[PDB]
Design a protein around this motif. Sequence first.
Motif, short mmCIF file in Angstrom:
data_model
loop_
_atom_site.label_atom_id
_atom_site.label_comp_id
_atom_site.label_asym_id
_atom_site.label_seq_id
_atom_site.Cartn_x
_atom_site.Cartn_y
_atom_site.Cartn_z
N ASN A 46 0.85 -1.19 0.00
CA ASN A 46 0.00 0.00 0.00
C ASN A 46 0.88 1.24 0.00
O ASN A 46 1.37 1.67 1.05
CB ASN A 46 -0.95 -0.04 1.18
CG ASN A 46 -1.91 -1.19 1.08
OD1 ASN A 46 -2.34 -1.54 -0.02
ND2 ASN A 46 -2.24 -1.81 2.22
N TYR A 47 1.08 1.81 -1.19
CA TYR A 47 2.03 2.89 -1.41
C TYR A 47 1.52 4.24 -0.90
O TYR A 47 2.24 5.23 -1.05
CB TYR A 47 2.38 3.00 -2.90
CG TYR A 47 1.23 2.66 -3.81
CD1 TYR A 47 0.26 3.62 -4.12
CD2 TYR A 47 1.08 1.39 -4.35
CE1 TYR A 47 -0.80 3.33 -4.93
CE2 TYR A 47 0.01 1.08 -5.17
CZ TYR A 47 -0.93 2.05 -5.46
OH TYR A 47 -2.01 1.76 -6.27
N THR A 48 0.32 4.31 -0.33
CA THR A 48 -0.11 5.51 0.38
C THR A 48 -0.12 5.33 1.89
O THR A 48 -0.47 6.27 2.61
CB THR A 48 -1.50 5.96 -0.10
OG1 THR A 48 -2.49 5.02 0.32
CG2 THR A 48 -1.54 6.10 -1.62
N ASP A 49 0.27 4.17 2.39
CA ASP A 49 0.34 3.93 3.83
C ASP A 49 1.59 4.60 4.39
O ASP A 49 2.70 4.32 3.92
CB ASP A 49 0.36 2.42 4.11
CG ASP A 49 0.32 2.08 5.60
OD1 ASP A 49 0.54 2.96 6.46
OD2 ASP A 49 0.07 0.89 5.90
N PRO A 50 1.46 5.49 5.39
CA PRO A 50 2.66 6.11 5.98
C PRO A 50 3.65 5.12 6.54
O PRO A 50 4.85 5.43 6.62
CB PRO A 50 2.09 7.00 7.10
CG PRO A 50 0.66 7.21 6.75
CD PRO A 50 0.21 6.00 5.98
N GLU A 51 3.19 3.94 6.97
CA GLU A 51 4.09 2.91 7.47
C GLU A 51 5.10 2.51 6.40
O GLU A 51 6.26 2.22 6.72
CB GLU A 51 3.28 1.70 7.94
CG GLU A 51 4.05 0.39 8.04
CD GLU A 51 3.16 -0.83 7.88
OE1 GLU A 51 1.93 -0.71 8.08
OE2 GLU A 51 3.68 -1.92 7.55
N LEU A 52 4.69 2.52 5.14
CA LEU A 52 5.54 2.11 4.03
C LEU A 52 6.32 3.27 3.44
O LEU A 52 7.50 3.13 3.13
CB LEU A 52 4.68 1.45 2.96
CG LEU A 52 5.40 0.77 1.80
CD1 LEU A 52 6.42 -0.21 2.33
CD2 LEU A 52 4.37 0.07 0.92
N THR A 53 5.67 4.42 3.28
CA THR A 53 6.30 5.57 2.63
C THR A 53 7.27 6.29 3.55
O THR A 53 8.24 6.89 3.07
CB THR A 53 5.23 6.56 2.16
OG1 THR A 53 4.65 7.22 3.30
CG2 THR A 53 4.14 5.83 1.40
N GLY A 54 7.03 6.26 4.86
CA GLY A 54 7.73 7.13 5.77
C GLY A 54 7.15 8.53 5.68
O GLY A 54 6.20 8.78 4.94
N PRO A 55 7.71 9.46 6.45
CA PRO A 55 7.28 10.86 6.31
C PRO A 55 7.57 11.37 4.91
O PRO A 55 8.64 11.12 4.34
CB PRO A 55 8.12 11.59 7.37
CG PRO A 55 9.27 10.67 7.65
CD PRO A 55 8.73 9.29 7.49
N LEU A 56 6.60 12.09 4.35
CA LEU A 56 6.74 12.62 3.00
C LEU A 56 7.81 13.70 2.96
O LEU A 56 8.04 14.42 3.94
CB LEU A 56 5.41 13.17 2.51
CG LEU A 56 4.29 12.14 2.40
CD1 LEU A 56 3.05 12.77 1.78
CD2 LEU A 56 4.74 10.94 1.59
N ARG A 57 8.48 13.82 1.81
CA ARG A 57 9.50 14.85 1.66
C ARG A 57 8.88 16.23 1.75
O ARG A 57 7.80 16.49 1.22
CB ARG A 57 10.22 14.73 0.31
CG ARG A 57 10.68 13.38 -0.04
CD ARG A 57 11.21 13.37 -1.46
NE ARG A 57 11.66 12.04 -1.80
CZ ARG A 57 12.52 11.77 -2.77
NH1 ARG A 57 13.03 12.76 -3.51
NH2 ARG A 57 12.85 10.51 -2.98
N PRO A 97 12.41 3.90 -4.56
CA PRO A 97 12.96 4.97 -3.72
C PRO A 97 12.15 6.26 -3.72
O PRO A 97 12.57 7.24 -3.11
CB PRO A 97 14.35 5.21 -4.34
CG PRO A 97 14.13 4.92 -5.80
CD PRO A 97 13.16 3.74 -5.82
N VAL A 98 10.98 6.27 -4.38
CA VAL A 98 10.22 7.51 -4.53
C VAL A 98 8.82 7.37 -3.94
O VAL A 98 7.89 8.07 -4.36
CB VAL A 98 10.16 7.94 -6.01
CG1 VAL A 98 11.52 8.44 -6.47
CG2 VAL A 98 9.69 6.79 -6.90
N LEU A 99 8.67 6.50 -2.94
CA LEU A 99 7.40 6.41 -2.24
C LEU A 99 7.12 7.62 -1.35
O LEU A 99 5.96 7.86 -1.00
CB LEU A 99 7.35 5.15 -1.38
CG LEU A 99 7.40 3.85 -2.19
CD1 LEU A 99 7.33 2.66 -1.26
CD2 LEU A 99 6.27 3.81 -3.22
N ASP A 100 8.14 8.38 -0.96
CA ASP A 100 7.94 9.52 -0.08
C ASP A 100 7.81 10.83 -0.84
O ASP A 100 7.84 11.90 -0.23
CB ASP A 100 9.06 9.61 0.96
CG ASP A 100 10.44 9.78 0.34
OD1 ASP A 100 10.60 9.64 -0.89
OD2 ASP A 100 11.39 10.05 1.10
#
Lengths: 620, 620
Positions: free
Chosen positions: A195-206, B613-616
């Motif tokens: 799930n590429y919108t889950d914060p668990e996976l993405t981390g904090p957004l740039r 590398p671009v999930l964030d």
Amino acid sequence: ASPFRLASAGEISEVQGILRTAGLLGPEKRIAYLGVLDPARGAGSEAEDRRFRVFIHDVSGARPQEVTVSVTNGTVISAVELDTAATGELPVLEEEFEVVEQLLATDERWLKALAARNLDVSKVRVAPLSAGVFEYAEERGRRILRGLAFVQDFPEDSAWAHPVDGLVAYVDVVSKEVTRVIDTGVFPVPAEHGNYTDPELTGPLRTTQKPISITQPEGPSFTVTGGNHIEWEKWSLDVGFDVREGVVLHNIAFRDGDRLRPIINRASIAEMVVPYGDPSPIRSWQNYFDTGEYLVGQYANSLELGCDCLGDITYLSPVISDAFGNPREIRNGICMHEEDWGILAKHSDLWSGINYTRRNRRMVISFFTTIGNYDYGFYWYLYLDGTIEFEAKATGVVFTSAFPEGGSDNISQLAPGLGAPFHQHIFSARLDMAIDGFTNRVEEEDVVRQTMGPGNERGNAFSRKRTVLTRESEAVREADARTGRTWIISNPESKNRLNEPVGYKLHAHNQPTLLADPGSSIARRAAFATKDLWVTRYADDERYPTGDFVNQHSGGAGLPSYIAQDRDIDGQDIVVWHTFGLTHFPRVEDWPIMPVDTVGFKLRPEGFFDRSPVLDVPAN
Amino acid sequence: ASPFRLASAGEISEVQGILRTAGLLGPEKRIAYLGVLDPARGAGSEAEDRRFRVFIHDVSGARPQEVTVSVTNGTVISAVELDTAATGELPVLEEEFEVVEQLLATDERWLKALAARNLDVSKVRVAPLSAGVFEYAEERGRRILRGLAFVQDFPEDSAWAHPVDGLVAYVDVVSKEVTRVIDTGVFPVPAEHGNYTDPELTGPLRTTQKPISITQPEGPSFTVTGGNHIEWEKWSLDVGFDVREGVVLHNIAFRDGDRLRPIINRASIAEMVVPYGDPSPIRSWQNYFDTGEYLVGQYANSLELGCDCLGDITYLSPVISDAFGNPREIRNGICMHEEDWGILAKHSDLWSGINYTRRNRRMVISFFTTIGNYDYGFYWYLYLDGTIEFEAKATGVVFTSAFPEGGSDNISQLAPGLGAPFHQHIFSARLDMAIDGFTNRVEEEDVVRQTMGPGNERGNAFSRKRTVLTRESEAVREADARTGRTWIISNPESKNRLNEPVGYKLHAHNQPTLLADPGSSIARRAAFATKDLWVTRYADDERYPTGDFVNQHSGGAGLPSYIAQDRDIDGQDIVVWHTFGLTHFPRVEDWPIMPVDTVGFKLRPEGFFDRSPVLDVPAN
Ligand SMILES: [Cu+2]
Ligand SMILES: [Cu+2]
Ligand code: NA
Ligand code: NA
């Protein structure tokens, strides 16, 4: 007033009415394809006749029909019953997609397979895939879809992360029967989510990306008239849309002085095939003809300003038919805009003291489509200097499988237990050429190396050779990157000021063609994809490289049957068919959602103009 | 404080002072090359030592010298006299260019040739070209330039439109002697002008182009620190500049979580060669080594805002040495900016209901150079997804000749009587690799086709094979576009979360390599250009594929001599050298000033990251 205008909602409603009154659109009928026909050659009689071609499916099992209708005259021109065991099944209907999962949910064999794996049937999504033609005699003349299963842990979950390997089912979507359920053994269902919108996976957004603002204070440099006629920087063209092919370019021409000079009469992506290279019986049948079986135009996305299309965007919203003949608008389905494209020409001359720089730009016409897990962008580019380019952008989510213990020669590992089978994405561009008119020819141009000796005493010379393709039987060509092979389309009756035939040169990317064994079902059904370039004599009914009815069609309809006529192509009305594709060995970086990869081709003028066509570009 | 900082004017002035006091820079001396040396391997001792390498020419005929200087310690480290008949002549000096035309203007043989053609010597420009090594024994150990003549009708005229064919002269630029004047016969001088700013030729300028405004309201997303250290979207690097190579990229790394992961230690275009394919004795000697003979960095253009570089631009102004050791600033010589790059990733999922789109961008580092009639743009690109790309942009004015009556197999006609000889433009990229550190290896990856049969019953499977290059003698590789050949640089000691070695994949354009006969002078001097890929073991002194002294050097110094050491390259400190080029058959559209054509290569991550590398990247 233009014969190439987009279909209107009113035209489609009239077609529906004409069909209904003719008795051709009862409650058991579905429209599987509806599209406007291009004008016939030599339509200079001005006698406009807007005609539509319709494929009509029957959900009760009666024979389908192909129908041509004149909205101009309000009549059925012809209506033919189809024998689908012979000529192929109709394209897949959107409403048949959901039938597969629903039918499997009540099948005892399917339920037993899910029970063995402790999977809740309510959580199991089934990808409905085209069937092809293989060893199953009971499928001849029936509409079959095959289904592969994926687990959705919750409604917003990406099911692609959880393939159920070792299991496939075949479904007759008309009789509503599950014909076969094949279970080759239990594989663990990969457990990690994707799930590429889950914060668990993405981390904090740039927070590091600063805005880029692209604007046009005086508006764009192109004009749109008659709904779909474009004029831009000496280019003139009409943008069509067809539910099968998507965006189609008509009447591409260039205003050279006071002459409007034709270049391409019709440009389209006339087929695209996605063959999978995994020999497991669960997937060895898997080949998508996205254009011919699914119709890529009907799944076009609505494109969002600032996100999908950035800058000063002009949209078209093409109208298509739904399954019942009602008009349906694809809002903001086509983006058009111009883009800066760097330096066009530059020279700083020591002797003259003149320093000169000009900037390039391109006109962009694009749409995006979504078919299941795959998303494809189709981009046409026109440049100031006369170059025409096509680019396909592939993204979305890769099709997955289990990754077998002990590895695989045919599947990449993306995550623990999660695999992605090798595959290709191959396109066919159909270019109905009209270089300065319709008398055209194709030459193959190779670099020629020369040996050191008399007349080449220092061993530095090299040259080139051009071979005219004179008949269709010799016009099936292969790439040769090592010899710099290109193809030139010229007009032998139109010469530049140096008395040379005007021309355009096709530059291919020289990617691999179809890899499957030549004796395979897919090599027979996608014969176009085994060679880089084909040239045919124009004919009204030779529209697609795979024939009119691709779904479950055995072979024997498209390019191999056309070229058997061995027609004269030396200074005649010809069509170039270019095969080009991506060979995809999935990488870890493609997961859980794939960064765009691209492939395409371009055409550049080759003595078409008497000098550079961009000398009148101003200094900016 | 960074050892990779740009050379300062103060450093160059100190080098000049050190040389002068040492007695090495008298009035007869000229600096032909001056550049900073990179730190030695394992310079983690922090003991900074800024050293400069200098080639010193002597205009009186004394032997030149190679000198290394420490500005840190203020001393000459070494100074060696050079035997140029053995090891090659020094690069061409800017001040020697004008000598050729001036010396010919007083030579009786040259004047007689011009008189026969009714040309005023005051109107005749002479292109001073490098000499190469051919049959003339008297040239061994002398600095020779060859001259070709062009007529300038008036001071602002483009002389390239008026070649004086059938005439060549050779000049010793140190003794100031014209050694040979060769006149093979009178050709008419083409009369049409090529003045691309003359309204007579351009016509009225277009008024149809509306502005495109690219701005960054909050400034750019990258930061510049220490003069030349760049941080942008997880990338980190240092931008160097060398008068021979131009822009050099150091310490390319990617911030993955809390680890700064190295990728490329040094990236540069280490040679470029332009060989001509016309067998006429007037031009059959013609081959430019723009990097090695002329030094492309010293002719870098000053780039104009809004014209050469569009958007929010950050400039660097590198400092170089003139011929006397004075610092000279190239104002606005390097453009840096970020660019929108379309869609990065996109998926609309039917099952989850989530629609997702992200936009791509790239960081651009570029410079432009002008050598005579040619202008080249060098572009390095860094993308969000970890891709690294290089692109060369070729424009300027094509080199011309007469077009012979009865045509030519080796020259294109551009205008009445005006020809353009066939040629290539070939680059060598030197990539000192550091994928996750210095223990790297190269594998060649080919597609593998499989035959229909047991285990592949439907004939759909395909695969790939990877071959490790273990020693230099087996690391000279050729392209194979038909088998989709690529090369993977991996670190066998650094694994991703799937326990696979991390890597990057090199994607070549698969253009033709050097076409000249293998027994030719140019094939021996540009051996690197005969093959697509070379891998060497790193060594301090193996900097250029053609050796240190390319000018008039016979052969026997660069890549063929390096690889003869047959060193271990399997999990070692290695350097990849990639050859890539354009083969140019000039077209009418290239005249009178050529639209840009491009060539390049790219590297994409291949299991370097544990997922995309671009999930964030945020939604924009
Ligand atoms: Cu793919
Ligand atoms: Cu060129
Ligand atoms: Na045609
Ligand atoms: Na290295």
